[PDB]
């Protein structure tokens, strides 16, 4: 496909720009800020995060229940950016743990659970707090 060659160019360019504090697009600036913030959360909360993550014991039969239980707990007292970031990090770690354990089928399922949760439970708050543009302001790394 010529589409996939285009996508490879776009991905590479987007990365190079990001390394130098620039952005291919607004969406790329959001993605990049969320990547960094995920990294930072995992650094700052390694112990608690790896602790709760190790007690999951992911199975295909139990993975959805485990996802949904964790996210209802994490957002029980409302939504804020930090929680949003832990939510993303949580999903990443469940994907990694699924692949570690040869349950690669869970990966798309988990992306679907996240997108709908983001969409239905997080998005209104996000948009009432200035949307992802506010997130990049406060959490991104960008040039000026």
């Amino acid at each position: 496909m010529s589409q996939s060659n285009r996508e490879l160019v776009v991905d590479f360019l987007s990365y190079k720009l990001s390394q130098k504090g620039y952005s291919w697009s607004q969406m790329a600036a959001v993605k990049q800020a969320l990547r960094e913030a995920g990294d930072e959360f995992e650094l700052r909360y390694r112990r608690a995060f790896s602790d709760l993550t190790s007690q999951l014991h992911i199975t295909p039969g139990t993975a959805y229940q485990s996802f949904e239980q964790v996210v209802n707990e994490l957002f029980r007292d409302g939504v804020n950016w930090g929680r949003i970031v832990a939510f993303f990090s949580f999903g990443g770690a469940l994907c990694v743990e699924s692949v570690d354990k040869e349950m690669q089928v869970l990966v798309s399922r988990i992306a679907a659970w996240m997108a709908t949760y983001l969409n239905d439970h997080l998005e209104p708050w996000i948009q009432e707090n200035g949307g992802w543009d506010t997130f990049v302001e406060l959490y991104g790394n960008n040039a000026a």
Partner: peptide, 18 residues
């Protein structure tokens, strides 16, 4: 308890341009 407890704590660094 514990994910709610972690949820309540989370601070990351912020670009406080102040």
């Amino acid at each position: 308890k514990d994910w709610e407890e972690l949820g309540e704590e989370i601070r990351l660094k912020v670009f406080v341009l102040g």
